[PDB]
């Protein structure tokens, strides 16, 4: 099969591809293990095939800068398609070129510090809810599963910061607004379906004309009307929906379908991510009680008498920022960043022909011995205000970099910190016998634990 | 396009087909209206195209007999495929030829009168549940939606008669066993997806190798393990599951996957059907209060003092059998029966080449003036023990006929009658202003009401 | 189906589309008849659907100018895809965007007046061959079929002006170089296959990965090696091949596969076109003997004593230019021009959303009563140096207009005129009884005669 | 992927399959080498996957008998599909079940000894033509390529024994009837296209509805009308066409399209096969001059004075029968026989589930040391009337066995022997320096030589 000669011709190393399958059989241990092995075997750049799709992996920090910043608009502007999307075509994370650029413009003022400081009282109320829910699991000394308790917390923060709907998801697990939203899970890009998509990407057109979508047709049909109800109950009679409604009052405003799609993508974006990361952080705190104590002391110092957190007092807390960042290092939940090269180019001395997918293997670089000492260890001091200067922003990329980076970065860090502050103000977290130490990562296509994290939760009362 | 000449060549009338689409655009008013129009325009036989699939419609009672009985095993043994089925390939209603014949054998003793008489105490307990639920909607004079109250009743009867699980679905609408099972709805064979299947049936192979199934992969993955739990909690420590478990203790026994598929098909089969028919019957009773009174008097006569119904006392009630049958006449929820002609044949003097789909248009014949006087009226006397002899069993076919007829006929009639007896022992049913008189049928691909049936429910107390 | 609402929403008239088929059933009489009917029914602009592909037809000369010239590079740069192309992707007529722009640059100097004046002695020798072949059919008074005699002439001119190979195709109809090249016929975009492509354009990806090509794999595999033989017999030891070989000695030179593709596209481009047009011209001359006499007199005046034609004496002949142009008016063999709108735009006051195919219906405009008197008549005087000023270059477009017009315009007119001069110097052409007067055009997807043109050929000796 | 567990579950050995590809990458050396390796590694039975299609290979002579004879009608009646066939669906070699059984009936009397004895004078005349053509290549001592000279001979015999058309193909290589027929070449079931068919057999439906056929649409459209011309020039005013025309004067007669398809399949069947085998025989004779001398002496003894061969004198020649048979042993051009198991069965003690493809690896068994001494050597004595009794007819299967064996066996052997007799009566055949000794077989999907056979041909004058 062809085009399997491309990397050989350019003199670029990589595992030899099978006809039709390319290298996918080498995903049997997951993107992370494949990426490290490749980084190790082949060095600073390499190439492989997702079916017939050539993928060029790069690790030089200069050349990563060019791809994510300098030549973003001109050359490296879109991600690769992945499956049938339906109307979700209009979602900023999926849209391309000038539609993207216009969307990214219309939504930027929504993620500003000013709007985010306005949303904090809402995210705070549900840290309280979280606490009372944790307390009920802690007065009845039963091991807690974090994904479920943080899931319900994440869910809570979303439903409020995007539509004003206010639910106790953990206690109302069967509210229609909680039921649909809980189906918006991260895509397993190595499950039968998406593997098939990589071998038969000519099948994508087929599904499209059949209205078959990787965003389940019914979750989308539920919110599309849920939004047009809210839209016309507020109109006329502080959340993301309002901020978008206010905006459609670049250019060309925001279409009504265009608004529904962004609403959906934020839910999708903020739900399993926030839930997952918080779990990873509580695992590390529970297996490193010194770090947990140190941070608890920091929180009490800024917030004595279990004082509530604020926007300014959150940004005050340096050790908490160190804990969060180091966790995202060990578990960057995206694992890779990816851009489609839209033209023949040469950058930092290397020819890149049109159509290749440039890939940055985040997981692998966050654990590269050549930039991190004992990269497997949990050492928050790597981010102390002393050492935070020796860290290359193109090697540590948990939100990506450049114009197409994670637009929800600020919000996500602030959301996760408000949960951590409130939770640690009230509770300590200890390993159980049934806790999996050391945590093994899932050999699938998601960064998540093989086994869900379970811990003992104790009242500081 | 070809083969669009087939009917023209055989001298068979029918609407002229468009290339690729055949006649599907003539489904814009539904199978029922198309069938009547065709019966009227073209007479006793006609032909049309579901894409490229030729479909030969027949209405002579002799020739229907040949197709459903005399030449079933030899010629007319399977239905037509309809979409990707996954493992549900093994479900009796879908299986073909000797696999079907063997399955139909292994499950026949499960639907016998003897087993059915044993299941009646279980179906009865949930008529009681139904009552208390109706009473709560009747002491608070709010119009009741029948599909929801009978749905929860149907659901209840199924969960018990197939797995022993005992739930108040109406009050536990969010039990995991109620949540999955409520997704097993009747297929809308004119929704975008299935229309596309008829135009692109070459797409079926494509979806199959992609594990894409019209039976949602997650409902099936939930019950497959739900069964292997029950299976191994009873083994070792009266429902359909047991009767199948006892059977795998023709020939070749029942595979473990083969058992899970039948379990699923019965749920699918008994849930929206029972729920739908009961609604149609209560609509007719409410718009014909004489008939409702007459039947109430019959029930009190057999069952004085609201005596509970039994298997024998149900079969006693002739006017109730007349009401149920007449309703199935006006609304035969399958609408058509269909067999694939597997060979060149000639029956009753007409050549039928291999591959055609012989179709019997049940809806249309149940309302044919040539066999029924005032076919639009609700006249239960057409089935009185006096006139029940002048009714051609190949014209009145609400469960089909012959070896491949509805294996659940007995159970379904008995289930629906036990619900009707208990409900009418306690309540009368009257039209609301918001009730749709006269009921309009859905122009889709299901026999169901355009608008859901709503009635006033009053206590005979 | 969707997107069938687009034109309705924009307030644009057009025939109402069927689901999936759009308007293709309205091609049952050909693009030409559909275009006129539409122009007539709907006016100055209209819209229709090639399946799901929206096609916007326009006839205002200002707005045509914008599309073909002013906004060519920025907005209207590519044609629409049509089927699986294989490596022919690299052919200038098919390539897109900057690949096109670079190719069109590398081949422009090949079609200059200077190169074309150099090629004339070669094209002339085969007008002689043509004559002797015609004379053999004229001394034996048998009606001649023009496509066959002009086909062999066209073939001859190509094989020489592109590779130096010198064959009498008419007398060597079974030379391997004549056999393959004669398979490069114009695509019937309404034959079963291409119709299917319009209804299932999602099938194009499928064929591509199967190396299935609308350019037969074996004709292309024959010339690809035929070229690499010639290439390496001239290297080292006046045709298009040389001019390209000299060029690969914008930028990025011409790839070796890139050269083979252009070679092929010129053959394809020059063979049935030149052959077809010459036939149309000889039909009109034979049914308008005054015009034929007048031109014969002109040729004798410039070229007395049957003097051979030259580059300068060809451009001298004004009545011949009038005859050729008027014929291309009545039969513009492309029928339409087409550009893909690559962005949301507004031109001359009309919104055009991304993805639509702007179409200019050349055939229909060449016969529009609003710009031509008696448009069905053959009146060469419409192009006399007197009236040639009142003709809008955006209404008379037989080679298209703007940067993406027919790069072979000069060559094609010069090739056809040299054939006409030599042929008329020696012969007159008269209708037979078996000649089809009036010529009916083919209801297919090609501009060609229903029945092939047959004429009586007489020696001016 | 699934169903890749089937052979593992049944305890059947075989090479471990890759997802989607099964074992096709093990065809990189051809069916023959794979089959031997497997026979060697795994023994008497084994299993592998052509994509997802399970293929069960068997070598026990009893169990082969069951599959090809005893359970042919009931269980093992069809071959496997292979690609899109169009109307060629009706060709006996491709048709299935009762259509096959009826076709095989209607054509059996055409291949009888009596008809075959009637066709011999026609096949003889073209042995003469063959000779004069060979003599022209032998008086001009140039090495002859056998495929071309025997191709033209084969072609000649076909065109006459199927339609009465009489051509010297070698000297008329560009007659329209010779041009089309020469495109009917053996399918390379490992060329890109057919490999793709095995990985994407769900693509077969797609091509079918696109009228795309592995029998080129134009060769079939040429003969379909070529036949309806001959058909209606003989009607009314000794070949296969006549014998079929006489037959349509089981049951249901032969359709007109059904007749055209058989005509085509015989051409396809008799052209490259006869041409190929004759080449293999002349290679062995030329590298074993003793055998060549011995046979020449036999021919002179039966046919002194270069007497012409007859039907009876051909069957007389035992050493010639030995030479032909031994060659078919070393090169059985089908390589394998194959039947689709249409039901769950057990034969000779082994469970075979429905859908598997039972395969008999002819090539491998013809060279199995366990039944043949020095199986690589060319020893015609293995078939002497002495040893011809120790040869298992289910191990030596160059025409298959049972009801679905090669219907053209008699004709093919007789055709090849008449060519050999005439050729050897007049010429001896010697190796050239450019002859490939030892002949290497093609690693493709055809049994043919890597390099075409070239020999020195000398006049016995
Ligand atoms: C711990 C939480 C999160 C992490 C680790 C994370 C990580 C990422 C990464 C790596 C990217 C790709 C950046 C690139 O390509 O350079 C991304 C993109 C994106 N993120 Fe997040 N993200 C998080 C939370 C969120 C949240 C809460 C939102 C809610 C609005 C969000 C919205 C988006 C969007 C819309 C994009 C695509 C932006 C574009 O293409 O212009 N993310 N995220
Ligand atoms: C009011 C209720 C029902 C109606 C009107 C109904 C109607 C029908 C009809 C018309 C058929 C096709 C018969 C034919 O092709 O001749 C059928 C088949 C079938 N029914 Fe029902 N049905 C009902 C309830 C049920 C229930 C409760 C079950 C539960 C077991 C069931 C199981 C089946 C099965 C398995 C088949 C396919 C049988 C075969 O192919 O052998 N049905 N039904
Ligand atoms: C009577 C003869 C011919 C006629 C009427 C004709 C007509 C046309 C037309 C209408 C176009 C499209 C122009 C547009 O889109 O604006 C075209 C394009 C083209 N023609 Fe011709 N043509 C003729 C002969 C030839 C010949 C002999 C060649 C040989 C080189 C040729 C090469 C091309 C090419 C390469 C294109 C595509 C150019 C591009 O996309 O940049 N044509 N022709
Ligand atoms: C040296 C020449 C030939 C060889 C080695 C050969 C070999 C074979 C083989 C192995 C089969 C499959 C048998 C089986 O599945 O058991 C076959 C089938 C067949 N052969 Fe030949 N063959 C030859 C020549 C011919 C010729 C000249 C014809 C002309 C009529 C022909 C017509 C057929 C047909 C129609 C079938 C399929 C029969 C059926 O499925 O009923 N073959 N051949």
Q: How far apart are CA D59 and CA D67, in angstroms?
A: 11
Q: What is the resolution of this structure in A?
A: 2.7
Q: Which of A198, A153, A267 is nearest to A21 (CA)?
A: A198
Helix (H) or strand (E) holding A50: strand A45-50
DSSP, collapsed to helix, strand or coil, labels residue B415 as helix
Beta bridge mates, C11: none
C382 CB-side CA count, 13 A: 23
Task: Say if residues C414 and C120 touch (Cβ distance below 8 Å).
Answer: yes
Could you tell me which residues are beta bridge partners of residue D345? D352
Q: Which atom of ligand 3 is nearest the CA belonging to C240?
A: 30
Q: How many residues does chain D have?
A: 461
> Measured from the CA of D104, which atom of ligand 4 is nearest?
41
Give the gap in angstroms from C-alpha C12 to the nearest C-alpha of chain B.
25
Q: What are the φ and ψ backbone dihedral angles of D347, each rounded to 5 degrees?
A: -135, 135
Domains of chain B: 1-461 (1.10.630.10)
Q: Which two tokens stand for residue C396?
A: 């008379």
Quote the tokens at residue A49.
């095939």
Return the DSSP state at B376. T
Within B225-364, strands assigned E span: 337-340, 345-347, 350-352, 357-360
DSSP single-letter state for residue A414: H
- Neighboring chain D residues of A21 at a CB cutoff of 8 Å: 18-21
Instruction: Check: CB of residue C167 under 8 Å from CB of residue C151.
Output: no
Residues of C at the D interface, defined by Cβ within 8 angstroms:
173-174, 192-193, 196, 200, 203, 206, 209-212
State how far the Cα of B47 lies from the Cα of B359, in Å rounded to an integer. Answer: 10
Tokens 């959340």, located at residue: A239
Distance of alpha carbon D326 from alpha carbon B209, whole angstroms:
45
Structure tokens that stand for C314 in this block: 């060809």
Tell me which of B70, B151, B269, B272 to substitute to probe ligand 2's pocket, judged by most ligand atoms within 8 Å of the beta carbon: B269
3-state SS, residue D397: coil
* Closest residue by Cα to residue D329 from D371, D299, D292: D371
The closest alpha carbon to B340, from B101, B104, B96, B105, belongs to B96
Alpha helices in B288-408 (DSSP H): 289-302, 311-316, 318-330, 362-366
The answer to whether A109 touches A247, Cβ cutoff 8 Å, is yes
Sign of the dihedral defined by the CA atoms of residues A27, A31, A32, A37, in that order? positive
Outline where DSSP puts E strands in D271-398.
337-340, 345-347, 350-352, 357-360
Q: Which positions in chain B have a beta carbon within 8 angstroms of at least one beta carbon in chain C?
A: 18-21, 25, 199-200
Of B276, B274, B296, B275, which is closest to residue B285 (Cα–Cα)? B296
Whether the CB-CB separation of A335 and A76 falls below 8 Å is answered with no
Q: Pairing mode, if any, of strands D337-340 and D345-347?
A: unpaired
Helix (H, G, I), strand (E, B) or coil at A86: helix
Q: DSSP letter string over B138-179? A: HTTT-PEEHHHHHHHHHHHHHHHHHH-----TTT-TT-HHHH
Does residue B212 sit in helix, strand or coil?
Answer: coil
Neighbours of D157 (CB within 10 A): 27
Cβ C193–D209 below 8 Å, yes or no?
A: no
Give D-chain residues touching A200 at CB under 8 angstroms.
200
Distance set, CA B199 to CA A406, B5, C20, C26 (Å): 42, 17, 9, 20
Terminal CA-CA length for chain C:
67
Q: Which of D399, D405, D392, D404 is nearest to D63 (CA)?
A: D392
Cα–Cα distance measured from residue C77 to residue C71, given in angstroms and rounded to the nearest whole number: 8
Which residues fall within 8 angstroms of residue A290, CB to CB, at 6 or more apart? Answer: none
Torsion angle (degrees, nearest 10) of CA D198, D200, D201, D206: -140
Burial class (CB in 10 A: 0-12, 13-18, 19+), C101: middle
Cα distance between the two ends of chain A: 67
Please answer yes or no on whether A209 and C52 come within 8 Å at the CB atom.
yes
Question: Distance, in angstroms, between D80 CA and closest chain C CA?
Answer: 21
Q: Chain D: nearest CA to B202, how far in angstroms?
A: 5
Cβ partners under 8 Å of residue A11, min gap 6: none
* Residue C202 to residue A201, Cβ atoms within 8 A: no
* B211 to A203: CB separation less than 8 angstroms, yes or no: no
Q: How far is CA D223 from CA A364, C449, D158, D234, D253, in A?
A: 64, 26, 14, 16, 21
**Helix locations, A235-310, DSSP H:** 240-247, 256-287, 289-302
User: How many whole angstroms from C166 Cα to the centroid of ligand 1?
Assistant: 65
Convert chain C into a string of H (helix), E (strand) and C (coil): CCCCCHHHHCCCCCCCCECCCECHHHHCCCHHHHHHHHHHHHCCEEEEEECCEEEEEECCHHHHHHHHHHCCCCCCCECCCCCCCHHHHHCCCCCCHHHHHHHHHHHHHHHCHHHHHHHHHHHHHHHHHHHHHHHHHHCCCCCEEHHHHHHHHHHHHHHHHHHCCCCCCCCCCCCHHHHHHCCCCCCCCCCHHHHHHHHCHHHHHHHHHCCCCCCCHHHHHHHHHHHHHHHHHHCCCCCHHHHHHHHCCCCCCCCHHHHHHHHHHHHHHHHHHHHHHHHHHHHHHHHCHHHHHHHHHHHHHHCHHHCCCCHHHHHHCHHHHHHHHHHHHHCCCCCCEEEECCCCEEECCEEECCCCEEEECHHHHHCCCCCCCCCCCCCHHHHCCCCCCCCCCCCCCCCCCCCCCCCCHHHHHHHHHHHHHHHHHHEEEEECCCCCCCCCECCCCCCCECCCCEEEEEECC
The residues lining ligand 3, judged by C-beta closer than 6 Å to any ligand atom, are C 92-93, 104, 265-266, 269-270, 273-274, 277, 333-334, 337, 398-401, 404-408, 411-412
Q: How many CB pairs under 8 A join B and C?
A: 16
Q: How far is C201 from chain A (nearest CA, A)?
A: 9
Contact D203 C203 (CB under 8 A): no
The two structure tokens encoding residue C448 = 């060609």
Task: For Cα atoms C388, C389, C395, give the angle at the middle one, nearest 5 degrees.
Answer: 80
Inter-chain residue contact D212 with C193, CB threshold 8 Å = yes
Residues of A in contact with D18 (CB under 8 A): 18, 21, 25
Across D263-356, the runs of DSSP E, i.e. the strands, are: 337-340, 345-347, 350-352
| Ordered strands of the D45-50 beta sheet | D45-50, D53-58, D357-360, D337-340
**Residue B20: partners with Cβ closer than 8 Å, 6 or more residues away:** B1, B51, B52, B199, C20, C21, C199
Say which residues have a Cβ less than 8 Å from residue A167's Cβ, sequence separation at least 6: A155, A156, A159, A175, A177, A178
One-character DSSP codes across D171-231: T-TT-HHHHHHTT-PPP-TTSHHHHHHHH-GGGHHHHHHTT--SS-HHHHHHHHHHHHHHH
C343–A98 CB contact, under 8 Å: yes
Q: A168 forms bridges with which residues in the sheet?
A: none
How far apart are alpha carbons A200 and A424 in whole angstroms? 48
Best of B191, B212, B217 to substitute, by most chain A Cβ atoms within 10 angstroms, is: B212
Q: Mind giving me the DSSP string for A134-145?
A: HHHHHTTT-PEE
Residue nearest to atom 20 of ligand 2 (CA): B406
Q: What is the distance in angstroms between the CA of the first residue and the CA of the last residue of chain B?
A: 67
Burial D253-289 (b: 16+ CB within 10 A, else e): ebeeebbbbbbbbbbbbbbbbbbbbbbbbbbbbbbbe
Distance from CA of B170 to the nearest CA of A (A): 14
Report how far ligand 1's centroid is from the alpha carbon of A337 (Å): 11
| CB atoms inside a 10 Å sphere around CB B354 | 14
As a dihedral over the C-alpha atoms of residue A55, residue A60, residue A61, residue A62, rounded to 10 degrees, the angle is -100
Could you tell me if the CB of D404 is within 6 A of ligand 4?
yes
N- to C-terminal Cα distance for chain D? 67
Find chain C residues with C-beta within 8 A of B194's C-beta: none
Q: How far apart are CA B327 and CA A265, in angstroms?
A: 48
Lookup result for tokens 């890597």: D450
For residue B1, give every residue at least 6 positions away whose Cβ sits within 8 Å of its Cβ, in sequence order, or none.
B19, B20, B52
**Which residues of chain C are within 8 Å of residue D193 when distances are taken between CB atoms?**
210-212
Residues β-bridged to residue D56: D47, D358
CA distance C330 to chain D (A): 32
Neighbours of chain D (3+ CB pairs under 8 A): A, B, C
Method: X-ray
Q: Under 8 Å CB-to-CB from B155, ≥6 apart: which residues?
A: B167, B169, B178, B181, B182, B271
Tokens 């029918």 map to which residue? B14
Residue A388 CA to ligand 1 center (angstroms) comes to 22
* Ligand 1 pocket mutation, candidates A274, A399, A401, criterion most atoms within 8 A of CB: A399
Q: What angle do CA A270, A273, A275 make, to 5 degrees?
A: 95
Atom of ligand 4 nearest to the CA of D68: 16
* Nearest CA owner, ligand 1 atom 40: A93
The answer to whether the beta carbons of residues C363 and C355 sit under 8 Å apart is no
Q: Which residue has the tokens 């699991």?
A: A137
CA distance linking residue A405 with residue A391, whole number of Å = 18
φ/ψ of B456, rounded to 5, equals: -90, 130
Reading the block at residue A138, the tokens are 């802690």
Q: Alpha-carbon distance A202 to C205, whole Å? A: 5
What ligand has the least distance to the C-alpha of A402? 1
What's the distance, CA C93 to chain centroid?
12
Q: How far is the CA of C370 from the centre of ligand 3 (A)?
A: 27
Asked if residues A278 and A151 have their Cβ atoms less than 8 Å apart, the reply is no
Give the C-alpha separation, B29 to B441, whole Å. 10
Atom 11 (ligand 3): residue with closest C-alpha? C406
Q: State the closest ligand 2 atom to the C-alpha of B413, by its place in the atom list counted from 1.
A: 1
CB D47 within 8 Å of CB D57: yes
Residue with CA closest to ligand 4 atom 36: D406
Q: Tell me how far apart the alpha carbons of residues B57 and D233 are, in angstroms, rounded to a whole number.
A: 43
Distance CA D33, CA A96 (A): 50
Report the b/e string of A184-223 with b at 16+ CB within 10 A. Answer: bebbebbebbebbbbbbbbbbbbbbbbbbbebeeebbebb
The neighbour count for residue D44, using CB atoms within 10 Å, is 11
Closest residue in A to B218 (Cα–Cα)? A183
In sequence order, the 6+-apart residues with CB closer than 8 A to the CB of D19 are A21, A25, D1, D4
Alpha-carbon distance of D344 to D29, in angstroms, equals 33
**Alpha-carbon distances, residue D392 vs D59, D99, D330, D349 (angstroms):** 12, 31, 16, 21
């Amino acid at each position: 099969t062809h085009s399997h000669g491309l990397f050989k011709k350019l003199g670029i190393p990589g595992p030899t591809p099978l006809p039709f399958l390319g290298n996918i059989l080498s995903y049997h241990k997951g993107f992370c293990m494949f990426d490290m092995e490749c980084h190790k075997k082949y060095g600073k750049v390499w190439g492989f095939y997702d079916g017939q799709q050539p993928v060029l992996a790069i690790t030089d920090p200069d050349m990563i800068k060019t791809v994510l910043v300098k030549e973003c608009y001109s050359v490296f502007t879109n991600r690769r398609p992945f499956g049938p999307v339906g109307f979700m075509k209009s979602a900023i994370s999926i849209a391309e070129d000038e539609e993207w650029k216009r969307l990214r413009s219309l939504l930027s003022p929504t993620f500003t510090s000013g709007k985010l400081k306005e949303m904090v009282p809402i995210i705070a109320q549900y840290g309280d809810v979280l606490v009372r829910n944790l307390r009920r699991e802690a007065e009845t000394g039963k091991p807690v599963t974090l994904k479920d308790v943080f899931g319900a917390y994440s869910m809570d923060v979303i439903t409020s910061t995007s539509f004003g709907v206010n639910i106790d998801s953990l206690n109302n697990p069967q509210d229609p607004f909680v039921e649909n939203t809980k189906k918006l899970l991260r895509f397993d890009f190595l499950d039968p379906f998406f593997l098939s998509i990589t071998v038969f990407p000519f099948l994508i057109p087929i599904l499209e004309v059949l209205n078959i979508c990787v965003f389940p047709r019914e979750v989308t049909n539920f919110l599309r009307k849920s939004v047009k109800r809210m839209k016309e109950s507020r109109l006329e009679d502080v959340d993301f929906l309002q901020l978008m409604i206010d905006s459609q009052n670049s250019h060309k405003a925001l279409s009504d379908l265009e608004l529904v799609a962004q609403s959906i993508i934020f839910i999708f974006a903020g739900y399993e991510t926030t839930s997952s990361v918080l779990s990873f952080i509580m695992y590390e705190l529970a297996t490193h009680p010194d770090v947990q104590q140190k941070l608890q002391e920091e929180i009490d110092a800024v917030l004595p008498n279990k004082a509530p957190p604020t926007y300014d007092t959150v940004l005050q807390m340096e050790y908490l920022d160190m804990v969060v960042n180091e966790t995202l290092r060990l578990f960057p939940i995206a694992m890779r960043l990816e851009r489609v090269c839209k033209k023949d180019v040469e950058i930092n001395g290397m020819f890149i022909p049109k159509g290749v997918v440039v890939m940055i293997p985040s997981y692998a670089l966050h654990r590269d011995p050549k930039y991190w000492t004992e990269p497997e260890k949990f050492l928050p001091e790597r981010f102390s205000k002393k050492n935070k200067d020796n860290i290359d922003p193109y090697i540590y990329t948990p939100f990506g970099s450049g114009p197409r980076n994670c637009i929800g970065m600020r919000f996500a860090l602030m959301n996760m910190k408000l949960a951590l502050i409130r939770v640690l103000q009230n509770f300590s977290f200890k390993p159980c016998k049934e806790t999996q130490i050391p945590l093994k990562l899932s050999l699938g296509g998601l960064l998540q634990p093989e086994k869900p994290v379970v811990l003992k939760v104790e009242s500081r009362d």
